[PDB]
Design a protein around this ligand. Structure first.
Ligand SMILES: Nc1ncnc2c1ncn2[C@@H]1O[C@H](COP(=O)(O)O)[C@@H](O)[C@H]1O
Length: 408
C-alpha cells in the first residue's frame, strides 16, 4: 500500500475520471490503454492536481512517470500561460532561438530521459504542448535544432541542461513545474552541483511559485535534505514481483477444479501461504466451506465482509493458523499480502491485466502461480500465450493450438 502524509493531504482517487483532467488527457489515456491508475498514481495525481509539492518514494514499475505527466499536462492545458503574451516574451531579434519551458523534468541518464519523453508524447498528442528531450553523449547541434521547434515540456539530464543554459538556448524564467526523477541516482552520479545551478542559481521561479515534485526509489538523508530545500509544504508519499514466478497453466473443467485444488494443497509443505482467487463472493464462501469440511485451515475475504471479518481473516492468514486465503481480486486490492508462496487462479479473470496483478502477489524470493483454464477462458488465450512466451515459461501445447484457431 501507499501512505501519504502532510498538512491537508488531498484524498486519493480510484479512477482517472475522479479528477477532471479534460478531454485531451482522457482521450490520450484511452490511446495509451491505461484502464485504471496505479497505486502511486491514485495518490500522486490528486496531490499534483491540487498544486501541492510532492516527495514521492517510488520506483520504476510504479507508473510514477504518468503520475507526474498526467496532472502537469492537464494543468498546462487547463490554465497554461496566455499564447500571444508569451510569444511576445519569447520572440527575439532572430525569432524564437531561446526556449522557455513551462515544465522541466530532470533525469539521470539518456535512457531514462528518453522514456519520460516518449511517455510525454503519448499525453501531449493533439495539444499545444511540444515536449523535448536533451542529454549528454550526443550531438548538441541536433538538440538545439530540436529545441527550436518547441519545448513547452523539456526532459533533460542536468549537465546537458547547464550547457544549453550557458549557450543561451534555454531560459527557466517561466518554468512553473519542476520534476526531479530518480533524484537519488542523480545525487549518486554527482549531479547535485548541476541541479543546484539549474534550480537555485539562475532564473527559475522559487518554491511556492513553481510547483515541485521529486521521485526517488530510496530516501536517504541527503534526499530528505534536498526535499527540504526544494519543496514547499510538501506531502511525503511512500509506496510499500516480475519474473521470480513460475507460471503453470492447466486445463481444468469446472466440476474438476475443487479436486485439482486439493491436490495442489496436498503438495504444499511447511508454512507456505497460499492465495486462492475465485470470481465471485458466492464462490469464495462456498469454496472456503468445502475446504473447511475437507479438513483445511483456510479463511476468505470478499466485498460483503465487514471490516472486522476482514481483520480476523488477515490475522489467521498472517499467523499461518489459516495459511490458505480465498479471495475475490477486488477484495485483495489494497491489502498487504506478500509472503505468498503460491497464487492459485481457481478462476481466471477476463483481462490479462488482472492476471498480472494477481500473480504479482507471489515471490516478492521464489514464487509459483497455477491457473485453472477451461472454455470459459477462451477470450484471454492470445494475451496469456503472449505473457507466457515473454516470461519464458512453459506454454501448454493446447494453448498455442487454440491461439491460432479460426473455426471454433
Ligand atoms: N495506469 C496504468 N495502467 C497500465 N500501465 C501503466 C499505468 N501507468 C503506467 N503504466 C506502465 O507501467 C510501466 C512502468 O512505469 P514507470 O514506473 O512510470 O517507469 C510503463 O510501461 C508504463 O507504461
Amino acid at each position: 500500500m501507499v501512505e501519504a502524509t502532510g498538512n491537508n493531504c488531498p484524498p486519493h482517487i480510484e479512477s482517472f475520471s475522479d479528477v477532471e483532467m479534460g478531454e485531451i488527457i482522457m482521450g490520450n489515456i484511452e490511446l495509451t490503454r491505461y484502464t485504471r491508475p496505479t497505486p502511486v498514481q491514485k495518490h500522486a495525481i490528486p496531490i499534483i492536481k491540487e498544486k501541492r509539492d510532492l516527495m514521492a518514494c517510488a520506483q520504476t514499475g510504479s507508473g510514477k512517470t504518468a503520475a507526474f505527466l498526467l496532472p502537469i499536462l492537464s494543468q498546462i492545458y487547463s490554465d497554461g500561460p496566455g499564447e500571444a503574451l508569451r510569444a511576445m516574451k519569447e520572440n527575439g531579434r532572430y525569432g524564437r532561438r531561446k526556449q522557455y519551458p513551462i515544465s522541466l523534468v530532470l533525469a539521470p541518464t539518456r535512457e531514462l530521459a528518453v522514456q519520460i519523453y516518449e511517455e510525454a508524447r503519448k499525453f501531449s498528442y493533439r495539444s499545444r504542448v511540444r515536449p523535448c528531450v536533451v542529454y549528454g553523449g550526443a550531438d548538441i547541434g541536433q538538440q538545439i535544432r530540436d529545441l527550436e521547434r518547441g519545448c513547452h515540456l523539456l526532459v533533460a539530464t542536468p549537465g546537458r541542461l547547464v550547457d544549453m543554459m550557458e549557450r543561451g538556448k534555454i531560459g527557466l524564467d517561466f518554468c512553473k513545474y519542476l520534476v526531479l526523477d530518480e533524484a537519488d541516482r542523480m545525487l549518486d552520479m554527482g549531479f547535485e552541483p548541476q541541479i543546484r545551478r539549474i534550480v537555485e542559481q539562475d532564473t527559475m521561479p522559487p518554491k511556492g511559485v513553481r510547483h515541485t515534485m521529486m521521485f526517488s526509489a530510496t530516501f536517504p538523508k541527503e534526499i530528505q535534505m534536498l526535499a527540504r530545500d526544494f519543496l514547499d509544504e510538501y506531502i511525503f508519499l511512500a509506496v510499500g514481483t516480475s519474473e521470480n514466478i513460475t507460471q503453470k497453466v492447466v486445463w481444468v473443467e469446472e466440476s474438476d477444479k475443487r479436486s485439482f485444488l486439493l491436490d495442489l494443497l496436498n503438495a504444499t509443505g511447511k508454512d507456505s501461504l497460499t492465495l486462492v482467487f475465485v470470481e465471485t463472493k458466492k464462490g469464495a464462501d462456498s469454496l472456503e466451506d468445502f475446504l473447511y469440511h475437507e479438513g483445511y485451515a483456510c479463511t476468505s475475504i470478499h466485498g460483503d465482509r465487514s471490516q472486522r471479518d476482514r481483520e480476523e481473516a488477515l490475522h489467521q492468514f498472517r499467523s499461518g493458523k489459516s495459511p490458505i486465503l480465498v479471495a475475490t481480486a477486488v477484495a485483495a486490492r489494497g491489502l498487504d499480502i506478500s509472503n505468498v508462496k503460491h497464487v492459485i487462479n481457481f478462476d481466471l479473470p477476463s483481462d490479462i491485466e488482472e492476471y498480472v496483478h494477481r500473480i504479482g502477489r507471489t515471490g516478492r524470493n521464489l514464487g509459483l502461480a497455477t491457473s485453472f483454464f477451461n472454455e470459459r477462458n477462451i477470450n484471454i488465450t492470445k494475451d496469456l500465450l503472449d505473457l507466457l512466451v515473454e516470461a519464458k515459461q512453459e506454454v501448454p501445447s493446447w494453448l498455442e493450438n487454440m491461439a491460432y484457431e479460426h473455426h471454433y
